[PDB]
Design a protein around this ligand. Structure first.
Ligand SMILES: Nc1ncnc2c1ncn2[C@@H]1O[C@H](CSCC[C@H](N)C(=O)O)[C@@H](O)[C@H]1O
Ligand SMILES: NCCc1c[nH]cn1
Length: 286
């Protein structure tokens, strides 16, 4: 039972992406919801400051940027990215150099974690203000979430908004983690969190937010067959384990095999087993 954490991770992650509607789900939220969300973040401003936490390869960031530009044509935008992976940054830069209509947008990449960024910003004398801050699918890697939430919320300017996206409390992950979390290998780099944990922390912090869920799925049909390589790749992903099927206790595996087909974990339709990958979109007000 080795923690999926790194060449196997990318391979499993990739498998996850091409077998789920995660990409499409996000894109759908951007088209239908994002406009309404960022509708007034640029009001009275001659420059819009966007802070991307864990921006990764930049696909979602550029989609976000397109909506802001559409809402505020002619307005300069400063899009700063906090990302610890040099590899991700390289991809992000490659994408930018490839995209065309980005004249009024300037980028800056800071190779560090949100925590390092936070302490670095606290060494400065006064904290900057941002019009839009987003943390997409990255809170799992933050050690102190309440401090992180409080800090970034304090960086929001007038009418600014903070967008956070993590899996939903009503997704299969939530159930998978609550029940088998302790039986999966642990890595000090990742912790299980869902919108339930998040809204609870936001409630205790006393911050105002709205939470929207968007159904997304992961086709894990291939997970039900000895040998199938893709199924095994997905097995590894769902368990954050390297070669789950070959190293995990048979009692664990067997039990998992059963639960993954239960209504609360997946839906069965068209002879397919679709793991509930519902995502939660949380918008926090300044
Ligand atoms: N503590 C931390 N602070 C900021 N970013 C972090 C981090 N730990 C990991 N990350 C970054 O978090 C990202 C998680 S993948 C997140 C998805 C990405 N926002 C996009 O939508 O594609 C990766 O780029 C990873 O390097
Ligand atoms: N759909 C979210 C993918 C993910 C990241 N970590 C765990 N699961």
């Amino acid at each position: 039972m080795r923690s999926l954490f790194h060449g196997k991770y990318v391979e499993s992650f990739r498998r996850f992406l091409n077998h789920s509607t995660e990409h499409q789900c996000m894109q759908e939220f951007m088209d239908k919801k994002l406009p309404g969300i960022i509708g007034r973040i640029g009001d009275t401003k001659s420059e819009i400051k966007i802070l991307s936490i864990g921006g990764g390869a930049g696909e979602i960031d550029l989609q976000i940027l397109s909506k802001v530009q559409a809402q505020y044509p002619g307005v300069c935008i400063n899009n700063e990215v906090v990302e610890p992976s040099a590899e991700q940054i390289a991809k992000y830069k490659e994408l930018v150099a490839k995209t065309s209509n980005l004249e009024n947008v300037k980028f800056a990449w800071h190779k560090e974690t949100s925590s390092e960024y936070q302490s670095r910003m606290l060494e400065k004398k006064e904290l900057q203000k941002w019009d839009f801050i987003h943390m997409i699918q990255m809170l799992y890697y933050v050690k102190d979430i309440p401090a992180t939430l409080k800090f970034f919320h304090s960086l929001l300017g007038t009418n600014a908004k903070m967008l956070i996206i993590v899996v939903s409390g009503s997704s299969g992950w939530d159930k998978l983690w609550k029940k088998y979390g302790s039986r999966f290998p642990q890595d000090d780099l990742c912790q299980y969190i869902t919108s339930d944990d998040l809204t609870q922390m936001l409630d205790n912090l006393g911050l105002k937010y709205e939470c929207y869920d968007l159904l997304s799925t992961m086709d894990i049909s291939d997970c039900f067959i000895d040998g199938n390589e893709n199924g095994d790749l997905l097995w590894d992903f769902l368990t954050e384990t390297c070669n789950f099927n070959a190293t995990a206790p048979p009692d664990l595996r067997a039990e998992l095999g059963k639960d993954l087909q239960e209504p609360e974990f997946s839906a069965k339709k068209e002879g397919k087993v679709l793991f509930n990958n519902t995502l939660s979109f949380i918008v926090i007000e300044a």
